[PDB]
């Protein structure tokens, strides 16, 4: 039970320096296998593909089958992954599906390729490329990207919609203006709509290979008319996402630090339990104050309102500092202070008279 | 390579301007926000 | 339905105490002082600004019957409690200790009565060396 | 009356999943018609243009004439579009003009092209491209772009003005330096000002096709002198608009939520009506307080000042939270509290003496 | 023109009450208490900081005659009221109910008198099952 | 005196619609002259250069000499441009120097070119290009750019310094690796350091004409090693300036509006005059309070401190709202309120006893 | 001792105009030597490499050996660089290592090249390029870059990881789709994985030389599929770093000015010394208040808590203004004011009765 | 120099009134009340936090002699007054009216005495129909 | 270890004064007034919100023993003092004057007693014309 939690914390959620050495050494071994599998595509080093590409791949798939069995066994220290359905929910998370696909595909390819031999080598090269995708444990790269893409989603649909719309319109206009123009080599330059559409995609993202350049000045006029406007709309996602990342980094340096949410979180639990304690009339929750059948009907209401206030204050204690925090605490402080000055006035009158 | 030298000069000139402003970022970096103005040092001498 | 909302109308009439149809902050403060709670004015204001939707500062009867109708068994209200337990979860595995939970419930936030914590513990699965799985303990109070 | 509002809410301002299925299925059908109309430009698939391009276009224009008639009839549940002039104002909004142009142009082309046949097919292809422009109901894409372009308009005129000015100057300088240079193929590279201007537009937006490269080193010196400065000025609109979109998304997460503007908005109406109630002397608005001809002259002044204050507070209740909100409420709170401490002092003196 | 601004000078002299030429917050508070309104000090300050342009805190006579001269029939002042009605517009079609408007006017914000709401309703087109088109009701109070 | 101010306000600092029509019509006439002067570079339209390029240029230089004389005369309604030295200071501001250079250069060219004729036409074309530079009256475009370049100057020297440094180093490395490689056409590709430096400037700003591509894999390795790092450093000025423009636009929507600085500005004048009134002992400034030779020595000190406080408050009343405004007014309010509660306590004790 | 500090302040940490003239003149001399060393690579100016490249290099290395000896001697006015180990710590900072490498490499090359002669000239050219790297004294350029790269490090690992991952995957896919396609010249276009990887690196950073363009439409489909997504991920570091620089410039204009941290910093010293004064029982620190063996045990606790509070307030006095500053001072002010109103109430009751 | 700073030492000793060597806010408030000015506590604090540089809250003698030594003839202090006049400049030409300046100086900000404004006007060039060039009027009070 | 934490338990019991197990702000204020310090309520609150980690506002015994256990010889706590001396370092060379340090310690911040400053100076290397190297003076109080 203790050793299961320790090898879970070693394989997933890494910490320390030894665990850095483990994960980075495994990545470095699989990338050296990638390089020695890739260098055989060059005509000089084609003799390296026969020996080390089989009897190292089988050792690497034994190592990545064993690590998957150990990790899937060791994921039982968590509460949510316990029993058969817990292991089945651990096995359907995406990077576990990626690792399972990699190990079963390497088993299939090493079973087929042992008895054609070129498609075996091609499958081995694609699996060596794919096997680096599960080095990112916890999905901390993809989740950080997905959050910023989701927050800025409307302004990122807007520019892509206007950019693709301009792309369709002007690829058709440049096809209309250049469908009979002849290159200096003699070939017809734009011969179809897919041809002008390849031109448009090469142009709007500012690659410009120069294999397809419009020849007549009507085509050059339309091409500049489209280029000047649409290059900004295909460059806007980099600007939107980059400024979103930088504003998020600036936001996370102002932050309600951790102890601030400790008495709030407990205050969410007790009140919630008190609501659950309200429906049993013979509980010990009716013994705080020290006869019934209408006091209980208002204690249930007061406890539900206290639960809602506690949930609101727990949600506020996790956000960074903001202007509504200042406005809220000044409203509370001025309200309490005005009530106390009213109290002092209410006592000073009728303590004297007038 | 008739007027080739011009191009070399044109890059180095621009780099000179950059480094020129860089040194002007150091020598005219006054850092006014102290309790020691030069006039205030002269008054503290008196 | 109707015999439920008649009882909610009776509970509203316990707070109203006149023919105004609204619950002010004073009409709630008098009830909470008759129970013996002594609320602050800002607490009485925070309990009403969570409930009303017109923004005027009092509670009407559809606003009162709205909060009493919806069940705590939700998606937001379950996940907030499931996250509130994770603050007090050493090692993050989804299990908390019995003595740690008894120390947290009786000291931090609202001091919960020790006789109430003795009731709180035995409802949850305590066997296994003092550890308790709090996700079943969230299923107990949200789904019911 | 109820069914008219329901089919208005179905055709315009969509919500639900059934209405998603409707709008996305109509878009998907018109894009499949676009693809099968576009693939006939390729020489292999040129036999597909004869059959399905007429007897599917006539069905699609019947469907988009019927939907336009139903939508224009059903726009009468709104208050502003009632009667003849209401329908005429619904028919002059821009996407309705786009849809009317599409349906009447398809009727014209299918009347002409039924009795030359290539220009008919060309008009059909252009209408199939144009018909995707009215899928964006409500104009939510174009209005979001137009707002951010309008707010940043001075800084977006500045960079475009300096960029085009540098473009004109250096296109003329590169034309002066390269007008007699001969390409390796033997042709004169820059033969006119339009030629050097096409060079400048290809260069400053970082496409660089490489069909026109200056040959002599004076031209290369001027070309680099211009390229290094002006590429930043043609890349600045993407940076300005992207940072504007990201700052707007950050701004909309701090927001005065909805109930805050409910007692303000009603307070704008009553006071305004009270101003309108002031000019009739026999109204019941003079019966709040409980003899005349000079009290009325000051009640009109007090009611106009209350109207101005209510309009200011309704305008403040719609903006997001800001620093002047904190400053305004602290000024009001400290003013009221200082007045009450002054009151307590004014009573404590002369309740005792000294 | 001149017989108008003489009457506005008389109305200014009702607020001034001395030879100062300025309306302070006390000289406005005494008038509003003689009418029986009991304003707060912050309300008296907000009513003056909307009017003056010199920023000193009192109201001169050209500042007083400026706000009394311009008509409410404008572009901003019409659109703000047209937007203020849209908060209370269920389904957004441009029609509000009679009973809903009577409930809103007598509860939210400034409690408008029921005798005044009875006058407010019958000026507008009420026929058609209780619905009322509020855009004509904005044209009634802004253009007139 | 009145007409001089009105024609000054018409020629410089424009407002209205008539003045828009004036300035935009003058710009449109000079740009039509630019287009008809530029189209003669094309071989087809070379016959247009003889007639209309002289007898329209002389009319346009008469019109821009007359407008300069009228504007320089009419700049005397301002206080700072009065007399001979005032006109000489009006004539040395930059756009007036530009306009004077344009009119005297057109006079010189039309005197020389009336009696070679190609260099006359070339000078006319360059003056037609230059004459659009003084359409921007007030310099509102260049000053807005100059402010944002000056504020972000250290971070804009940083990236340019690192980018040019990487450019020098890797242009030399690619020259070392590719100085003997032979193109497929047969020519030596990189033959000098200027050659590799043209390659580097074409590469780092992502133009990539493709006239000069390194051939050997050492050169391609160094080229990618340099490209991947240095393209971001040459793209950073667009990002820095664009985010600076967008943050400035966001900043100018929170702003202390105009009346806030009216009682502050007057309070800067009076106190300053009071300091100047302190040195004359027989002034009427010593008659506010109602015997000397040491009260005067402390009144001078109190007046100088009041001047410094008034200057500080005038500088604060022009900046936008910020967090230190909230902190400053809370410090002042809590200080005054604590003093008044101390006063109430000091009176309640010793009004009673104990 | 005084002259040592003055020549240290002259050579490092420059100020004034004379010191600008010194540093900029030394930079200008070494860049003129760079240009006259670089122009010999051109075939026309190859006769300049023999004379001035030796007998100016030896003078320049004498000048940069002398300046290094003077600076390393003069770095003893600082406290941390005193004695042998102080000079050894001054000699291991990075720009001093750069200057030492430059002077010893020029000595080695001028010793070898005086007796082959081309590699001597090549080493001289590389040292002339390297010698401009130590003009940036204090490292103010590299530290400003390093700070912004370190703060935004997670979001700058994210985009580079996803970009290189997409680069590997799609370079392999385009190699698979184009490995048998033949160019119009007749050559096999993509012959290895390094070939397709050079294609991928040229494409994703939007250079696009056009020497390698995929030929078959499967390759063009994969190329566009990859280009459209991955160009934004290779353009995001410019956006992230540029918006980070602009947010830092906006942040440094709100700032707790210098005098605010003067009584805090002294309050960090005294309390710290008081903690060190606690352990000696016969100090004079026990004589503030005016018998022992348990008062000392609580004075040590109170002094350690005062030290922690003073360290917290010194850390707060160096950060710019923020929202938690407003929240902290309102909490302190409302707490003190509520305590004083409680005091007034506690005295008013029992001064009267009831 | 020394006979100047001896007089500044005497003026400092008029504020000090003991052997402390510092000017507190109370020692300045007593002088301003002996002159009959009645300052607020926040005004007394703002007058000291502009002067001191140690940040402790009192004024030492080099801090006192520093502000008395530097002349108002500067670049910042001239341009701030030249900009402060431009708020009250209709049409922006650099000339303000005599009656407008007399109305501004006696109403806005610190109410300047009318006997002082009569002295203020005649020092400046008033001839030319009531217009006055304020840039010479800034040269008069900053350079002298 | 145990004979240390028994003494820390005794020192905690000097603050507790009952069987509560917590140190409130009143139980600390009474000790500081018995020593004769007169703390403000905000100072008593700032001294406790630096120590506790549960956020409830009092100090438990592991929280009390945690701050008494760790040594000031650290990396952050040394560098903050090394930076705090650099504010009072004219010319930035790493040496401060004796008379300047005596003037700073007895005036700014907490007024340190002159008898204590006489002890403070002679511990540090004062020879060399009044200059003192403060980095050894930071090594003296942090490493010991
Ligand atoms: Ca009621
Ligand atoms: Ca309500
Ligand atoms: Ca008055
Ligand atoms: Ca006024
Ligand atoms: Ca004193
Ligand atoms: Ca001081
Ligand atoms: Ca206790
Ligand atoms: Ca605690």
UniProtKB/Swiss-Prot annotation, chains A, D, F, G:
Among its keywords, does the record have Cell membrane? yes
Q: Where does the chain bind a 1,2-diacyl-sn-glycero-3-phospho-(1D-myo-inositol-4,5-bisphosphate)?
A: 138
Q: Which GO terms describe its cellular component?
A: apical plasma membrane; basolateral part of cell; basolateral plasma membrane; ciliary base; cytoplasm; cytoplasmic vesicle membrane; cytosol; early endosome
Intramembrane ranges, chain numbering: 194-214
Question: Where is the stretch described as Interaction with CALM?
Answer: 264-276, 300-314
Outcome (variant: residue 59 to M): In LQT1; uncertain significance
Renumbered residue ranges of the record's region Interaction with KCNE3: 132-140
Provide the effect of residue 89 to P.
In LQT1; uncertain significance
Its name, as the record gives it, is: Potassium voltage-gated channel subfamily KQT member 1
Variant or mutagenesis effect after changing residue 210 to E: In LQT1; loss of channel activity
Span of the entire protein shown here: 104 to 569 of 676
State how changing residue 136 to N affects the protein, per the record. In LQT1; decreases outward potassium current; decreases plasma membrane localization
Curated annotation (Swiss-Prot), chain B:
The highest taxon in the source lineage is Eukaryota
Where's it found, cell-wise?
A: Cell membrane; Cytoplasm; Perikaryon; Cell projection, Dendrite
Region listing for Interaction with KCNQ1, in residue ranges: 15-26
Q: In which tissues has expression of this protein been reported?
A: Expressed in hippocampal neurons (at protein level). Widely expressed with highest levels in kidney and moderate levels in small intestine.
Q: Which residues cross the membrane?
A: 4-24
Q: Extract the coiled-coil ranges from the record.
A: none
Known consequence of changing residue 37 to N? Decreases current 4-fold in KCNH2/KCNE3 channel
**Residue spans, topological domain Cytoplasmic:** 25-46
| Pathology linked to this chain's protein | Brugada syndrome 6: A tachyarrhythmia characterized by right bundle branch block and ST segment elevation on an electrocardiogram (ECG). It can cause the ventricles to beat so fast that the blood is prevented from circulating efficiently in the body. When this situation occurs, the individual will faint and may die in a few minutes if the heart is not reset.
Q: What does this protein do?
A: Ancillary protein that functions as a regulatory subunit of the voltage-gated potassium (Kv) channel complex composed of pore-forming and potassium-conducting alpha subunits and of regulatory beta subunits. KCNE3 beta subunit modulates the gating kinetics and enhances stability of the channel complex. Alters the gating of the delayed rectifier Kv channel containing KCNB1 alpha subunit. Associates with KCNC4/Kv3.4 alpha subunit to form the subthreshold Kv channel in skeletal muscle and to establish the resting membrane potential (RMP) in muscle cells.
Q: Which family does it belong to?
A: Belongs to the potassium channel KCNE family.
**Subunit-level organization:** Interacts with KCNB1. Interacts with KCNC2. Associates with KCNC4/Kv3.4. Interacts with KCNQ1; associates with a KCNQ1:KCNE3 stoichiometry of 4:4; produces a current with nearly instantaneous activation with a linear current-voltage relationship and alters membrane raft localization; affects KCNQ1 structure and gating properties.
Protein's UniProt name: Potassium voltage-gated channel subfamily E member 3
Of the parent protein, the shown chain spans 54 to 99 of 103
UniProtKB/Swiss-Prot annotation, chains C, E, H, I:
Also noted in the record is: This protein has four functional calcium-binding sites.
| Activity regulation summary | (Microbial infection) Inactivated by S.flexneri OspC1 and OspC3 proteins, which specifically bind the apo-form of calmodulin, thereby preventing calcium-binding and activity.
Q: Which family does it belong to?
A: Belongs to the calmodulin family.
Could you say which residues bind Ca(2+) 2 here?
Answer: 52, 54, 56, 58, 63
What positions does the entry give for Ca(2+) 1 binding?
16, 18, 20, 22, 27
N6-acetyllysine modification, residue list: 17, 90
Q: Which disease is it linked to?
A: Ventricular tachycardia, catecholaminergic polymorphic, 4: An arrhythmogenic disorder characterized by stress-induced, bidirectional ventricular tachycardia that may degenerate into cardiac arrest and cause sudden death. Patients present with recurrent syncope, seizures, or sudden death after physical activity or emotional stress. CPVT4 inheritance is autosomal dominant.
The modified positions for N6-methyllysine read 111
Designated name of the protein: Calmodulin-1
Q: Which UniProt keywords apply?
A: Acetylation, Calcium, Cell projection, Cilium, Cytoplasm, Cytoskeleton, Disease variant, Flagellum, Host-virus interaction, Isopeptide bond, Long QT syndrome, Metal-binding, Methylation, Phosphoprotein, Repeat, Ubl conjugation
List the GO biological process terms.
Answer: autophagosome membrane docking; calcineurin-mediated signaling; cellular response to interferon-beta; cellular response to type II interferon; detection of calcium ion; G protein-coupled receptor signaling pathway; G2/M transition of mitotic cell cycle; long-term synaptic potentiation
Positions of the UniProt region annotated as Necessary and sufficient for interaction with PCP4: 72-144
Report the GO terms under cellular component.
calcium channel complex; calyx of Held; catalytic complex; centrosome; cytoplasm; cytosol; extracellular region; myelin sheath
Q: Where in the cell is it found?
A: Cytoplasm, Cytoskeleton, Spindle; Cytoplasm, Cytoskeleton, Spindle pole; Cytoplasm, Cytoskeleton, Microtubule organizing center, Centrosome; Cell projection, Cilium, Flagellum
Domain EF-hand as annotated: residue spans: 3-38, 39-74, 76-111, 112-144
